[PDB]
Ligand binder design. Structure first.
Ligand SMILES: Nc1ncnc2c1ncn2[C@@H]1O[C@H](COP(=O)(O)OP(=O)(O)OP(=O)(O)O)[C@@H](O)[C@H]1O
Ligand SMILES: Nc1ncnc2c1ncn2[C@@H]1O[C@H](COP(=O)(O)OP(=O)(O)OP(=O)(O)O)[C@@H](O)[C@H]1O
Ligand SMILES: [Mg+2]
Ligand SMILES: [Mg+2]
Ligand SMILES: [Mg+2]
Lengths: 462, 462
C-alpha cells in the first residue's frame, strides 16, 4: 500500500456533498486540511494550480520505477558499465528532501540548521562517531549550493536511489579504487561531483529528450491517479473566484495529461454534460520556468493550440477566451486576473519552486500538497506508541528512534528522525499556510471557512 | 527609566552566590535566560564575546543623543540646511529593527513575511487603506536589499529618528517641493535614496573619522554601563572553559573601553587583586569585520599593543600569551582554541552579524543580548491586561492594538504590534538558542545547567 494506492482509493469514492457528511469526512486526518497560519477562505479570489504531482499525481512505485529504468538506460548508453542494468528501483530506500554531498558522495538527512540526522554512503549507514571524520561539527553549510544538492521533489526519488546504487556499485567493484572524493579507474578519475552531474543530466534528458513522457501518456491508467471529484472541486472554485494553471510542463504534454484527468462520461457531477479541461480555467500558462517565474520571469509568448508550437514574437495582447500563454511572470497572472498576492491561493507540490518562492517573492497565500502524507499519516497513528515512548524518555533513545524511523523506510519519515524535525518539515511549517495529502481535501470545507492556527508567543511572553 | 537605567540598577548590586539566592533571583524575568532551543551548558567549551552593546552597554538616551547630535553636525557641515540644528533626539520615537524604504522615504515595521505592521512617512503614521497606494499587497520584498534597509542595531537608533526628522522637515518646508521619490529644490533633486545614503555615510563618519569615540571615552560614567559582576562571571567561565573576544572595533578603542569596564579596586571578587582586562581572555581579536568574519574573513594580522598599530604582513605564528589578533576568520578562533562550532557559545547583540550568520555559516551555539528587554519586560507585565484582552477578542481590536503599542513608544514593541510578531522577534526565535536582557544573567545558573525548550510538532502530528 503506497501513498498513491491511498490517494487512488479515496479518488474512487463519489462525493457526498451533504453538509454533515462533509464535516464528518474532514475529521479524518487523511481528508483534512492542516493549518500553519490562519487563512480566511472568503478572502481568496484566485485559486492557482500546477499540474505535475498536484493535479496529476503519478502512481508509486510504477512511475519512479519507469524514471529509474530510463535514467539507467541513458547512463549505460553514454558509457556507464553494463552492471547498472542489474539495478532495480527500491521504493523502501529513498525518502524525499535528502541532500547529496557531491564532495564525499553521501546522502544526508538534515535539520533546518544543517545538523546531520542520517548519513549514508551507498547503502552503508554511518553512525554518529564515524561521521565526524568528514563532518567535524556534524553540520553542513547549506549556502554551499555547489557542494550540496537538495532533492526536493517526487521527480527526484529515482535519482535519490540511483545515487546510492552507483556509490555502492563503484565501492564494491574491484575494477575501481575508492578515494575520498570519487573513484579511480586506471588513468580515469570519476569524482562524486561529476557522477552526480551525469545522473542529473540523464534525469533531465529522460524527461525532455527521452521516452518518459511518451511511455507515461501511452498508459495513463498505470501511471496517473484519476479522480471524478477533480472537476467538481474546480467548478466550485470557479463559482466563487477565478482559477488558473501555471505549469513548468509544455502545452502538448499538459493537454494529454489534463484531457485524461477530465475524461469521464460527465462534467463536474454525474448526469452533467462533459466539458473540455480548458473551460475550467480563467488563465492557462505553460513553460512557467518557476521559480524564475516569481522574479523577472521570461518573455510572454502565445501558444498556437492547433500545432502545439509557440507563435513567433512576444505576446502584447489582452486576456482572451481560449488563449494559452507560455513563459511570462507571476505579474502576468496578477495583472490579467486583477489580483493582489494575498487574493491568491497557489496550490503546489514543490516546496522551493512553488511555495517558498511565491511566499517570499510575492506574498501569495500557499497550499502545499504532500502526496506521501496519505501513507505517513497511517504510520504516524499506527505507531503512535513508539513516538509516545520517545517523548517520555539514551541508548534506548537511539534504539527507539531507529525503530520508529524504520517504519517509514530506510531513510525515515519525510518530517523527522525521532524527535528531530527535518529541513523539509521546517520549510513546510514556515512557508506553507495550508497543507494536505491532496488539494481535493478543500472539497470538504465550505468556501467561507476560516482555517485557524494559534498565535505564536516568544519564551519571555509565555 | 530607560532600559539602561534598569541594567545599571541591577549592575550596582553585589553578587550573592549562595546557591538558593541564585535560584530565587533567576526566577524574575529580568534576571532570567530565555530558551528557544535546548542547550546543555556542560557541552560548552568556549565562551565568545563581542564588546559594543554586549560587554559595553551604552547608556540611553545619552549615547543615542550624542550620536544624533554629531551626525546632524556632520550633515550640516557637508551642506544640509541649518534647520537640522534645531532637531533634538527623541527616544520615544524609534524602535529597533525598522526598515527604511529608500524609494518612498518610509519607515516600516514588518513581520517575517514582509507584511506591513506600521508605516510612517516622517511623523505621519499611515493607516491601512492609505498604505495601499504605495504597497498594493501591504507587503515588501525583503530580498530587494538595494531598496530596503533593515536598522538592526542599537547604533542605528539615532539614524532611525533622524530619517523621520529629515522627511518631516523637507515635506513641511516651503523651499522644497515633495515628489513620490524625494524633494525638488529648484534645479536640485534629492531622492530619499540619496538622502538615506548621506545619513548612513555621516553615521559611519562620526564613528570612524569623527569625535564620537573621543567624547565617549572622555566621560565613560555618563556613556557606559559598568558592573562589578562582569569580572566575576568571566573568571567563572574561564574555570570551566576558554573565553574569547571577537570585536568589530579597533584595538585602541577596545583597550580604553575594556580598561574602564574592569576598573574596580579588586579583581573578580572584592578582596582580590585587580588584574588587567586582557588576562580574562584566552584569545583577543579586533577588527573582526563580522559577518564576513564567518565566511572567508580577512587576512590575519597581529596588533602591536604598544603603538596600537598593526604589524606589517600576515601573521603566520601560533597562539602566544599576550598576542592580540586583527581580522582573520571564525576558523582562526576554532583552530587556535581547538574548538568545533557546537563547543562554542557566542554572545552577541547583532541579530544578523553575530547570531544569524554564526548559526547558519558555522553551526555555533548562540546567545543574544537584547538590552531593551530590561524595560520591555516591565511594560509586558505592567500592561498584561491589554494583551490578555486582545487575545480574548474589530475596530476594538485595532484600538486595543494601538493602545498596547503606544505603551512601548511611537513605533511599538521591538517584538510585536498587537498579535502580530515582528521580523526581529522571528529571527530571535529562529537563530538565538538563548536570549536575555544581559549576558550577566548566566551568572545565576550553574555551569552544568540544561536549558530546555519543548519539542516542536507539526499540525498533523498534534
Ligand atoms: N529547499 C530548497 N531547495 C533548493 N534551494 C533552497 C531550498 N531552501 C533554500 N534554498 C536556497 O539555498 C540557498 C542557501 O540556503 P540558506 O541556508 O543560506 O538560506 P535559507 O533558506 O534562507 O535558510 P533558512 O531556512 O535558515 O531561512 C539560498 O539561496 C536559499 O534560497
Ligand atoms: N536582519 C537582517 N539584516 C540584514 N540582512 C538580512 C537580515 N536578515 C536577512 N538578511 C539578508 O537579506 C537578504 C534578503 O532577505 P530574504 O528575505 O531573501 O532571506 P531570509 O533571511 O532567508 O528570509 P527568511 O527569514 O524567510 O528565512 C538575504 O541575503 C538575507 O541573508
Ligand atoms: Mg508540480
Ligand atoms: Mg556588539
Ligand atoms: Mg532564510
Amino acid at each position: 500500500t503506497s501513498w498513491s494506492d491511498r490517494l487512488q482509493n479515496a479518488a474512487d469514492m463519489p462525493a457526498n456533498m451533504d453538509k454533515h457528511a462533509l464535516k464528518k469526512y474532514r475529521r479524518e486526518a487523511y481528508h483534512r486540511v492542516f493549518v500553519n497560519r490562519s487563512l480566511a477562505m472568503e478572502k481568496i479570489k484566485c485559486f492557482g494550480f500546477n499540474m505535475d504531482y498536484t493535479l496529476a499525481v503519478y502512481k508509486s512505485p510504477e512511475y519512479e520505477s519507469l524514471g529509474f529504468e530510463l535514467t539507467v538506460e541513458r547512463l549505460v548508453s553514454i558509457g556507464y558499465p553494463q552492471e547498472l542494468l542489474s539495478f532495480a528501483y527500491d521504493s523502501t530506500f529513498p525518502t524525499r528532501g535528502l541532500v547529496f554531498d557531491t564532495l564525499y558522495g553521501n546522502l544526508l538527512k538534515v535539520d533546518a540548521y544543517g545538523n546531520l540526522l542520517v548519513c549514508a554512503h551507498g547503502f552503508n549507514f554511518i553512525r554518529g562517531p564515524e561521521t565526524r571524520e568528514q563532518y567535524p561539527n556534524k553540520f553542513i553549510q547549506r549556502d554551499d549550493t555547489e557542494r550540496f544538492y537538495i532533492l526536493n521533489t517526487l521527480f527526484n526519488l529515482p535519482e535519490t536511489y540511483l545515487l546510492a546504487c552507483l556509490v555502492d556499485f563503484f565501492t564494491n567493484c574491484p575494477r575501481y579504487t575508492s578515494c575520498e572524493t570519487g573513484f579511480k579507474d586506471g588513468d580515469l578519475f570519476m569524482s562524486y561531483r561529476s557522477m552526480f552531474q551525469d545522473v542529473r543530466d540523464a534525469v533531465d534528458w529522460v524527461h525532455y529528450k527521452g521516452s518518459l513522457k511518451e511511455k507515461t501518456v501511452e498508459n495513463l491508467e498505470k501511471y496517473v491517479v484519476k479522480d471524478g471529484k477533480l472537476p467538481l472541486l474546480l467548478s466550485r472554485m470557479k463559482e466563487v473566484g477565478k482559477v488558473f494553471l501555471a505549469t513548468n510542463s509544455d502545452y502538448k504534454y499538459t493537454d494529454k495529461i489534463m484531457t485524461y484527468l477530465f475524461d469521464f462520461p460527465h462534467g463536474p457531477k454525474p448526469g452533467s454534460s462533459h466539458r473540455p479541461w480548458q473551460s475550467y480555467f480563467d488563465l492557462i500558462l505553460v513553460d512557467a520556468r518557476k521559480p524564475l517565474f516569481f522574479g523577472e520571469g521570461t518573455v510572454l509568448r502565445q501558444v498556437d493550440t492547433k500545432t502545439g508550437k509557440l507563435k513567433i514574437g512576444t505576446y502584447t495582447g489582452p486576456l482572451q477566451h481560449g488563449i494559452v500563454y507560455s513563459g511570462g511572470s507571476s505579474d502576468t497572472i496578477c495583472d490579467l486576473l486583477g489580483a493582489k498576492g494575498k487574493d491568491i491561493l497557489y496550490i503546489g507540490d514543490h516546496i522551493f519552486g512553488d511555495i517558498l518562492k511565491s511566499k517570499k517573492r510575492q506574498g501569495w497565500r500557499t497550499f502545499l500538497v504532500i502526496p506521501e502524507l496519505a501513507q505517513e499519516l497511517h504510520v504516524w497513528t499506527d505507531k503512535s506508541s513508539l513516538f509516545e515512548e520517545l517523548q517520555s524518555l539514551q541508548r534506548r533513545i537511539k534504539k527507539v528512534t531507529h525503530d520508529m524511523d524504520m517504519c517509514y523506510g530506510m531513510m525515515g519519515s519525510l518530517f523527522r528522525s525521532g524527535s528531530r524535525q527535518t529541513l523539509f518539515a521546517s520549510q513546510v511549517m514556515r512557508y506553507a499556510d495550508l497543507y494536505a495529502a491532496s488539494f481535493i481535501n478543500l472539497l470538504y470545507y465550505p468556501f467561507s471557512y476560516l482555517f485557524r492556527a494559534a498565535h505564536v508567543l516568544m519564551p519571555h511572553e509565555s
